[PDB]
Amino acid sequence: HMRKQEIIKTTEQLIEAVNNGDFEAYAKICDPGLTSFEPEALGNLVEGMDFHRFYFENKPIHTTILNPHVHVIGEDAACIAYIRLTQYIDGQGRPRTSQSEETRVWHRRDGKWQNVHFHCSGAPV
Amino acid sequence: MRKQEIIKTTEQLIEAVNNGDFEAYAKICDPGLTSFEPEALGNLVEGMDFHRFYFENLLAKNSKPIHTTILNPHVHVIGEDAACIAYIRLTQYIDGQGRPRTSQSEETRVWHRRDGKWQNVHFHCSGAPVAPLQ
Amino acid sequence: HMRKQEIIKTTEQLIEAVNNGDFEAYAKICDPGLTSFEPEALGNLVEGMDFHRFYFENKPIHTTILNPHVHVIGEDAACIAYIRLTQYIDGQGRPRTSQSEETRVWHRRDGKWQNVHFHCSGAPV
Amino acid sequence: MRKQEIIKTTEQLIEAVNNGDFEAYAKICDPGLTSFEPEALGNLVEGMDFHRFYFENLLAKNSKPIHTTILNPHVHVIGEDAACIAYIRLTQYIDGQGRPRTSQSEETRVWHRRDGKWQNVHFHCSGAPVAPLQ
Amino acid sequence: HMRKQEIIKTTEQLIEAVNNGDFEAYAKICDPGLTSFEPEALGNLVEGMDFHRFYFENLLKPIHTTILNPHVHVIGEDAACIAYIRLTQYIDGQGRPRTSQSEETRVWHRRDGKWQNVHFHCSGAPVAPLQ
Amino acid sequence: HMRKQEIIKTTEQLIEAVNNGDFEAYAKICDPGLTSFEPEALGNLVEGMDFHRFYFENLKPIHTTILNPHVHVIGEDAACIAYIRLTQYIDGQGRPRTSQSEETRVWHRRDGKWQNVHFHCSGAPVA
Amino acid sequence: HMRKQEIIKTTEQLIEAVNNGDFEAYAKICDPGLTSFEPEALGNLVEGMDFHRFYFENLLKPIHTTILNPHVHVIGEDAACIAYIRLTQYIDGQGRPRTSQSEETRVWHRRDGKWQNVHFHCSGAPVAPLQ
Amino acid sequence: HMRKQEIIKTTEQLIEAVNNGDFEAYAKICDPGLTSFEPEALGNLVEGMDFHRFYFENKPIHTTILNPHVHVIGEDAACIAYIRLTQYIDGQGRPRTSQSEETRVWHRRDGKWQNVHFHCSGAPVAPLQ
Amino acid sequence: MRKQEIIKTTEQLIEAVNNGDFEAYAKICDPGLTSFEPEALGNLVEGMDFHRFYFENLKPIHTTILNPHVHVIGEDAACIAYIRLTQYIDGQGRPRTSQSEETRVWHRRDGKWQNVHFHCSGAPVAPLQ
Amino acid sequence: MRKQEIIKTTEQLIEAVNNGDFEAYAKICDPGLTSFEPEALGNLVEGMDFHRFYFENLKPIHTTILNPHVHVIGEDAACIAYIRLTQYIDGQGRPRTSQSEETRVWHRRDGKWQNVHFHCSGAPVAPLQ
Amino acid sequence: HMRKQEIIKTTEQLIEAVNNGDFEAYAKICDPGLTSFEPEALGNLVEGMDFHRFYFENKPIHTTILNPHVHVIGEDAACIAYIRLTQYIDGQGRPRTSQSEETRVWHRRDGKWQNVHFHCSGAPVAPLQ
Amino acid sequence: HMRKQEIIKTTEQLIEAVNNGDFEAYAKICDPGLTSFEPEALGNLVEGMDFHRFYFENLKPIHTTILNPHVHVIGEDAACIAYIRLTQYIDGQGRPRTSQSEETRVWHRRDGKWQNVHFHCSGAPVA
Amino acid sequence: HMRKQEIIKTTEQLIEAVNNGDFEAYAKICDPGLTSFEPEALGNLVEGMDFHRFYFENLLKPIHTTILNPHVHVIGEDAACIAYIRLTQYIDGQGRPRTSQSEETRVWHRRDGKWQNVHFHCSGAPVAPLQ
Amino acid sequence: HMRKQEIIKTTEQLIEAVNNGDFEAYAKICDPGLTSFEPEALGNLVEGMDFHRFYFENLLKPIHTTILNPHVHVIGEDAACIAYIRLTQYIDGQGRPRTSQSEETRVWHRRDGKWQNVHFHCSGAPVAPLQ
């Protein structure tokens, strides 16, 4: 019951890093061999941090994590699946909501939880 | 050689789906299997109940030749009991009008070993819905 | 914890009645003064059983109730909100999924739970 | 006269939304308020957190004249502590280009009385998203 | 509030007559000088009965009518106005169920004890069985 | 024949009030329990003056023409008028335009004055 | 008051002749030098009966015609002008009911005892049974 | 043969009045009970001068009258039917041609010819457009 | 009287086309007949061969000649310009009207009038069309 | 040699149009000139008034006359049919080509050749167009 | 003057062969190294008879050759450029006209004229279409 | 100059095998580790014969033309050919059609026979 | 082998003249009786230099031309035909790079010492700098 | 598997040269007889360097290139083929981030110790910085 809460908290930290444009914080939470399926990769599996770096190197936003399901797989491995609702204000000053479905696979390496795989479907945030 | 186990078990799971063999599918899937897939309209579905529907309503009438190709399988091993695979599923089939068609889906499968056998606990599919009844 | 399970079970029975075209069973579970917001009423509040009768009087289908939230309001009143996922086979023999968001307000009257108000958004089933 | 309490409290809730007064809104809403509304894309949302966003990002810059009309309010009384209201919300406003516009939404609000005050525990909105920032 | 219930009942009878294709019943309830605004008259005011006769005489599907939020204005003992939303449920050619909406105003005049429809305004869907 | 002319004249006054943005004049001619079907109410029946107030409080050459007015007199105290309202105006781009609406107005005489109790408008919103 | 009613009645007879495909009756009411503006003449002024004959000779459905707001100008004892809206209710090929509108001007001359149509202007829908 | 020429001339004068925006001249030639079918009346018969006044009260243009047919009906009544071709320059400076078919019914009252009825189909060809 | 000859001969030519009578058509047309018409896609065509095709591979049709203008140019040469209105019933049994503008240049040779040049704009109006 | 006169006079007429020289145009055209052309919307127009409009309210333009066919009809009458290719630069500075098919009927009166009838199909090719 | 007539005649024979589906006759007139630009080759230069054979191996039609220009280049070489107008009846029984612009380069070898190069733009006008 | 003609001839044989639905002949000419970019693979690199087998196992007049074949010889044992493939065929409705594809084929000589190890096709799928 | 290279070189010179807007150079290489089929002539055969002059005289951007798969037919000592694909790379108004393709046939006659272009057929894109 | 790593590295260098607009570096890695199939050549095979020069010489935005699933065929000691997916991340004119995909085949020949690109096939998006 307490291992599940670790995964949710670390996921929330990862998303805060993305929303703040803090690549330093993002890199600490992601394994360097992070694989990724996401809309902006056009159906390809991408390997690096290099692909994500681009969106960091180049407005109010509220993220909601809905119905998080955590699978614990022994002491060093966990999987989380959740819906990410993103409220933001667009360029024209209008409020907008986007939805994405996200799977994150976690591996505990030297005491910290590390994101090794990410699958995103729906809206790119 | 742990990587090759995961690829082989994934291939078996897909063979079960393509043959409409729910018996074989249930043996490979954990009963608490969670799933993101196009036909669930952005919702996380929990049972085997959601998948059962596509097996139970597949007759010889709905059969047709289909070849599945697994491209660039990446396997993450996470200790001795846990693995993640990500792959592209290319599906070649013949449609109703007799034309050949190709669809693509990106799939993540999370695996847990219980008493020597590998079990699928989570499945994420984006792109084409590729079950034979689809 | 046991009052919540009554509401879920009665909701499941109501939906089974609709899917089976059993107006007899549907009428027993619905209060005669049932009010309704639903797509096929074009933004109007409809009062009778008469409006629903039409769809009964005139194929495999599987219903899934997702993330049911039950509010208990004293001993005689409950509200349930859920997502209804409907798998069915259309006329052309193709498999299809529709989604609707449903609110049902319940009142206990002579021992039985009664549906007094229904709000449906999304797909008409 | 219980019916008139529910209509009046609903009118107060809507006045709070239109004035961007989150303080007044929070007093009328139960903290465990559940919500179905267009801007939540078919998901059930639990907090006040989702609604807070539309209050916190409303400045004088985003203000504009809006008249709300509640049509054909139907109130179901369910004992002494529980009520349901269903109504049509007509919203007249002036858009950016200075044109007058009308939007419609159908709203269900479920109410629970705690220590004499009426509290909104559940909200279902279909049709137009009608908060001033929308 | 017993005069209001007369108007609602007579309106329901008028609509039953239209749905049954019973011109005999329709003529009894309508004043012969009935004026009408309706979609099928293309924005023109039409004068009584001949225009409506056409839709009865050329009627050779299941339809349910619902009257929502009827508002009755009583204006002395001989005059009443009703405004209501008419929801029409029917099955189309392809066998699909459909709902159409119209907003209707009916002005009533009591002549020798019976209520008579002297004016009719319909906006939205044309909802006669012939369509 | 003289009761008919009262209704036409009062209808013309009501329309002049709308076109001038004179809510004071409009309120005198309309019963406070005025019901209304009109395009900007999206197929709903609206009650009272509050819905109409909005279009006055937040207010170019316009000519209004009443065509083929039919008046039903229903005793002393009740009348119904049906007419076509043709509106000539100049749009934003400076072009001349014509809009049409079909209007039913139900009238009730209360303490000597004629009052509009119900209004049905189909076609163009012409305020 | 009575000259106006002659023009309306003769106009109604002319339209009945068209709807019945009775060229014999039509020719009696029309002057042989009849000029005409109508949609099927593509913006040209056509002379004589020959252009109209075509729509009669090649007619081998229920239709109701309504004359709305007829205005008659009397111009001495031998000349009249009528302007009216012609509403035509008919059933189309697919069996659906339809309404078309045309605006019509007819100029009349009293000639060898009868009223004669010398000029016809039609705008809107072409409303001959052949369509 | 000379009554026909009166009708053509007075029709030409009426059109000159419209093109010059001269409501004074237009009112002299039109009967006060003038009825009218025209595109800008959306299929309705309009009665006044009030409807026309609007287009007067609020660019190079050449008008051509083609194939005028005059029916003379005794000494006090005439009907003219003609095609009106209108050449003008639009807002963007391009030359354009519009066509309308016009019927005008004339009644002589105290020596002057008066337009009592007007039917226009096709393009609305008043300068304000 | 020369004007009436040209109108009559033009009417005969059109009757020949409508009846699919190439024999009658050839008698009225000069063998060196030049032609501008829609079905020639903006090219000048010479001879009878191009027209023969529409006769050899051939419903109620009424033709109206409107506002015929005849220019007489001495005793052997004439030009006619007219609008051809064609009423016909299409395949689906519907009545249709098409318009074409036609110029025909005539030369009298050994007593008979001969069509030497034809310009058609608008609708192609021959049967099989 | 009569054929070359007609081609030369046609070339002069087109030069006058392209230069906006109504004076030169009027000398070559008969005052009773009839005309079928796109901007007359399928009507036959009489006189110079319709053409005057395009001169009075008037970029590089090259005209090419292709495959001119001249019919000579005695000593006073001729017909020419040709394709007019017009190269011009449009408003946006782009080069454009338009095509029209033209028939011109000529009558010799007091020694000079006069254009009595003109049929144009395809593009309207006058400047201001 | 007589060398030009040889080229026109042999071009007419080549087109007759295509329209009759007579590959035997076509092959005799074409050099075996015939190069070709044509719509059905999608902007590529094709070399063989093999590409053309396909349309032969697998309805009334009239062909007109307009404005043939022949360049004679010494005693063994000629170039012809012409417009091909093709009248045919389509599947739905309607009459249609298509246009193509054709260049054919000719080389005389042992007394016979041979087509060595063919450029076609516009409509593909082989009977199979 | 004679090595170039070998590659063209073997390419023509490969295309004849595809057009005849002769998987036996196709397999002899293709290396078992054949990689492929082609329209029906939706932008993915596909390995092996299995992807191609499908189009043979589930199989009208067709003429194929190879235009402007460019052959690069890279030592004894390696060659690359690039060509335009024009395909004339009759469609379902009986109409004649032309499709174009640009094709790169990389060849490796193993035990005396030329083998296709890589194939890139852009444009029309022409199987 | 050497007569083919003359034709390619002279064709390249002709295209350089067009791209430079050098009508002087263009006129030297073209026979005065040059016939032409090209997109901007709308399916007509045009004679002479006058049609081409227009595109030179009204030229007031970077462009690279590529001649692909030139096929030269030599027909005795004074006559040649070349067929080639002309690929034109240019930058459009919006500053974007674009490629257009045209298929070109040029017939050559050796006349007063020089090679002269007597006939030109262009299909596809119009590829003069004026565009 | 050290020959495979040479080909990947040289391919990465070639792409860096294109992205930097460094024609000098590009020319060193490409054989002068380089043949090419690519979107900007409209289905034609183009011969070496002049066609590519144009996109370098007229280059006056941030772009990241990713090479996915490189497959290298080694064919003896002097010949290699690489096939890969090129993912290109860039910011468009409107400031939005965009991804384009191309499939690329490069054929390599070793001449005097250095690897040379002799043939290039690109399908999908044209991904040069000038676009």
Short mmCIF file of N, CA and C in Angstrom, two decimals, chain I residues 2-71:
data_model
loop_
_atom_site.label_atom_id
_atom_site.label_comp_id
_atom_site.label_asym_id
_atom_site.label_seq_id
_atom_site.Cartn_x
_atom_site.Cartn_y
_atom_site.Cartn_z
N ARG I 2 -35.59 40.51 -98.26
CA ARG I 2 -34.32 39.75 -98.20
C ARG I 2 -34.09 39.25 -96.77
N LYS I 3 -34.43 40.06 -95.76
CA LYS I 3 -34.34 39.70 -94.32
C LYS I 3 -35.18 38.45 -94.03
N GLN I 4 -36.39 38.37 -94.59
CA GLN I 4 -37.36 37.27 -94.33
C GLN I 4 -36.85 35.97 -94.97
N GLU I 5 -36.15 36.07 -96.11
CA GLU I 5 -35.50 34.90 -96.77
C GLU I 5 -34.50 34.26 -95.81
N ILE I 6 -33.65 35.08 -95.18
CA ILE I 6 -32.53 34.64 -94.29
C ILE I 6 -33.13 33.95 -93.06
N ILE I 7 -34.13 34.56 -92.42
CA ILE I 7 -34.82 33.99 -91.23
C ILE I 7 -35.40 32.62 -91.62
N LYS I 8 -36.11 32.55 -92.75
CA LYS I 8 -36.79 31.32 -93.21
C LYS I 8 -35.75 30.21 -93.44
N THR I 9 -34.65 30.52 -94.13
CA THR I 9 -33.58 29.54 -94.46
C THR I 9 -32.90 29.06 -93.18
N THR I 10 -32.67 29.97 -92.22
CA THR I 10 -32.12 29.66 -90.87
C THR I 10 -33.06 28.67 -90.17
N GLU I 11 -34.37 28.95 -90.17
CA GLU I 11 -35.40 28.07 -89.55
C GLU I 11 -35.36 26.68 -90.20
N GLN I 12 -35.18 26.61 -91.53
CA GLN I 12 -35.11 25.33 -92.28
C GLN I 12 -33.87 24.55 -91.83
N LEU I 13 -32.71 25.22 -91.76
CA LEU I 13 -31.42 24.64 -91.30
C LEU I 13 -31.61 24.00 -89.92
N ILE I 14 -32.25 24.71 -88.99
CA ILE I 14 -32.46 24.24 -87.59
C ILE I 14 -33.44 23.06 -87.59
N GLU I 15 -34.48 23.10 -88.43
CA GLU I 15 -35.44 21.97 -88.56
C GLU I 15 -34.67 20.71 -89.00
N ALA I 16 -33.75 20.86 -89.96
CA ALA I 16 -32.93 19.75 -90.50
C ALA I 16 -32.10 19.13 -89.37
N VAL I 17 -31.45 19.96 -88.55
CA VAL I 17 -30.61 19.51 -87.41
C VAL I 17 -31.49 18.71 -86.45
N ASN I 18 -32.65 19.26 -86.07
CA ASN I 18 -33.57 18.68 -85.05
C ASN I 18 -34.15 17.35 -85.55
N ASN I 19 -34.33 17.19 -86.87
CA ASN I 19 -34.91 15.97 -87.49
C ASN I 19 -33.81 14.93 -87.79
N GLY I 20 -32.54 15.30 -87.63
CA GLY I 20 -31.39 14.41 -87.93
C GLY I 20 -31.26 14.16 -89.42
N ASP I 21 -31.66 15.14 -90.24
CA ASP I 21 -31.72 15.04 -91.72
C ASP I 21 -30.47 15.69 -92.29
N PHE I 22 -29.38 14.93 -92.40
CA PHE I 22 -28.07 15.41 -92.90
C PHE I 22 -28.19 15.82 -94.38
N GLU I 23 -29.06 15.13 -95.13
CA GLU I 23 -29.33 15.40 -96.57
C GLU I 23 -29.76 16.86 -96.73
N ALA I 24 -30.76 17.29 -95.95
CA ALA I 24 -31.35 18.65 -95.98
C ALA I 24 -30.31 19.67 -95.50
N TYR I 25 -29.55 19.33 -94.45
CA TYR I 25 -28.50 20.18 -93.82
C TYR I 25 -27.41 20.51 -94.85
N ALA I 26 -26.94 19.50 -95.59
CA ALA I 26 -25.85 19.60 -96.59
C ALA I 26 -26.26 20.52 -97.75
N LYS I 27 -27.54 20.53 -98.13
CA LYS I 27 -28.08 21.36 -99.24
C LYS I 27 -27.95 22.85 -98.87
N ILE I 28 -28.14 23.19 -97.59
CA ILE I 28 -28.20 24.59 -97.08
C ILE I 28 -26.80 25.10 -96.72
N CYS I 29 -25.87 24.20 -96.37
CA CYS I 29 -24.48 24.55 -95.95
C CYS I 29 -23.54 24.48 -97.16
N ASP I 30 -22.70 25.50 -97.33
CA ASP I 30 -21.54 25.48 -98.27
C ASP I 30 -20.61 24.35 -97.84
N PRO I 31 -19.98 23.60 -98.77
CA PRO I 31 -19.07 22.51 -98.40
C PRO I 31 -17.83 22.98 -97.63
N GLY I 32 -17.45 24.25 -97.78
CA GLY I 32 -16.31 24.87 -97.07
C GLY I 32 -16.74 25.61 -95.81
N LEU I 33 -17.87 25.21 -95.22
CA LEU I 33 -18.45 25.77 -93.97
C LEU I 33 -17.39 25.75 -92.88
N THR I 34 -17.07 26.92 -92.32
CA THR I 34 -16.23 27.05 -91.10
C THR I 34 -17.16 27.22 -89.90
N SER I 35 -16.69 26.84 -88.72
CA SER I 35 -17.54 26.71 -87.51
C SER I 35 -16.72 26.92 -86.23
N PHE I 36 -17.21 27.80 -85.36
CA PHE I 36 -16.85 27.89 -83.92
C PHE I 36 -18.05 27.41 -83.11
N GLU I 37 -17.88 26.39 -82.26
CA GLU I 37 -18.96 25.82 -81.43
C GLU I 37 -18.36 25.11 -80.22
N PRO I 38 -19.11 24.99 -79.10
CA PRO I 38 -18.57 24.43 -77.86
C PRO I 38 -17.87 23.07 -78.00
N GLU I 39 -18.40 22.18 -78.83
CA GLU I 39 -17.92 20.77 -78.94
C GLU I 39 -16.63 20.71 -79.77
N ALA I 40 -16.16 21.82 -80.34
CA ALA I 40 -14.88 21.92 -81.08
C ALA I 40 -13.77 22.51 -80.19
N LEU I 41 -14.05 22.76 -78.90
CA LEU I 41 -13.06 23.10 -77.84
C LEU I 41 -12.20 24.31 -78.25
N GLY I 42 -12.81 25.33 -78.84
CA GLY I 42 -12.14 26.61 -79.15
C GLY I 42 -11.39 26.59 -80.47
N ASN I 43 -11.48 25.50 -81.25
CA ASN I 43 -10.83 25.39 -82.58
C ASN I 43 -11.84 25.76 -83.67
N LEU I 44 -11.35 26.31 -84.78
CA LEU I 44 -12.12 26.50 -86.04
C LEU I 44 -12.10 25.17 -86.80
N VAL I 45 -13.26 24.59 -87.08
CA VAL I 45 -13.38 23.32 -87.85
C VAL I 45 -13.89 23.66 -89.25
N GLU I 46 -13.38 22.95 -90.26
CA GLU I 46 -13.74 23.12 -91.69
C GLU I 46 -14.62 21.95 -92.10
N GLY I 47 -15.46 22.13 -93.12
CA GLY I 47 -16.21 21.02 -93.74
C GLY I 47 -17.32 20.46 -92.88
N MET I 48 -17.96 19.43 -93.44
CA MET I 48 -19.23 18.82 -92.99
C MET I 48 -18.92 17.61 -92.11
N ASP I 49 -17.68 17.11 -92.17
CA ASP I 49 -17.27 15.84 -91.52
C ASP I 49 -17.51 15.92 -90.01
N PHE I 50 -17.21 17.07 -89.39
CA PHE I 50 -17.31 17.27 -87.92
C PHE I 50 -18.79 17.18 -87.49
N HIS I 51 -19.68 17.75 -88.30
CA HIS I 51 -21.15 17.78 -88.06
C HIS I 51 -21.78 16.41 -88.39
N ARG I 52 -21.31 15.75 -89.45
CA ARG I 52 -21.80 14.42 -89.89
C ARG I 52 -21.90 13.48 -88.69
N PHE I 53 -20.88 13.50 -87.83
CA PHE I 53 -20.73 12.61 -86.65
C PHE I 53 -22.00 12.67 -85.78
N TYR I 54 -22.57 13.86 -85.57
CA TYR I 54 -23.72 14.07 -84.65
C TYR I 54 -25.02 13.60 -85.31
N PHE I 55 -25.06 13.53 -86.65
CA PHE I 55 -26.20 13.02 -87.45
C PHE I 55 -26.14 11.48 -87.50
N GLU I 56 -24.98 10.92 -87.86
CA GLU I 56 -24.78 9.46 -88.10
C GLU I 56 -24.97 8.65 -86.81
N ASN I 57 -24.80 9.26 -85.63
CA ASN I 57 -24.90 8.55 -84.32
C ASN I 57 -26.13 9.04 -83.55
N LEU I 58 -27.16 9.52 -84.26
CA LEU I 58 -28.45 9.97 -83.66
C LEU I 58 -29.50 8.85 -83.77
N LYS I 59 -36.68 12.08 -79.11
CA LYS I 59 -37.10 12.87 -77.93
C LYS I 59 -37.72 14.19 -78.39
N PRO I 60 -38.75 14.72 -77.69
CA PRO I 60 -39.39 15.97 -78.09
C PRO I 60 -38.46 17.18 -77.89
N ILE I 61 -38.37 18.04 -78.90
CA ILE I 61 -37.52 19.28 -78.87
C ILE I 61 -38.30 20.40 -79.55
N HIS I 62 -38.45 21.55 -78.88
CA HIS I 62 -38.98 22.81 -79.48
C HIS I 62 -37.87 23.86 -79.50
N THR I 63 -37.61 24.46 -80.66
CA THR I 63 -36.63 25.56 -80.85
C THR I 63 -37.37 26.88 -81.00
N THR I 64 -36.88 27.93 -80.34
CA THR I 64 -37.37 29.31 -80.50
C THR I 64 -36.20 30.19 -80.92
N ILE I 65 -36.37 30.95 -82.00
CA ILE I 65 -35.41 31.99 -82.46
C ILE I 65 -35.91 33.34 -81.92
N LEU I 66 -35.12 33.98 -81.05
CA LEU I 66 -35.45 35.27 -80.39
C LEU I 66 -34.60 36.39 -80.98
N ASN I 67 -35.22 37.56 -81.20
CA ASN I 67 -34.56 38.83 -81.60
C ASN I 67 -33.59 38.59 -82.75
N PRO I 68 -34.02 37.96 -83.86
CA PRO I 68 -33.15 37.80 -85.02
C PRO I 68 -32.83 39.17 -85.60
N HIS I 69 -31.54 39.50 -85.70
CA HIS I 69 -31.02 40.71 -86.38
C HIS I 69 -30.34 40.25 -87.67
N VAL I 70 -30.81 40.74 -88.82
CA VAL I 70 -30.23 40.43 -90.16
C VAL I 70 -29.51 41.68 -90.68
N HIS I 71 -28.22 41.56 -91.00
CA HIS I 71 -27.45 42.55 -91.80
C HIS I 71 -27.42 42.07 -93.25
#
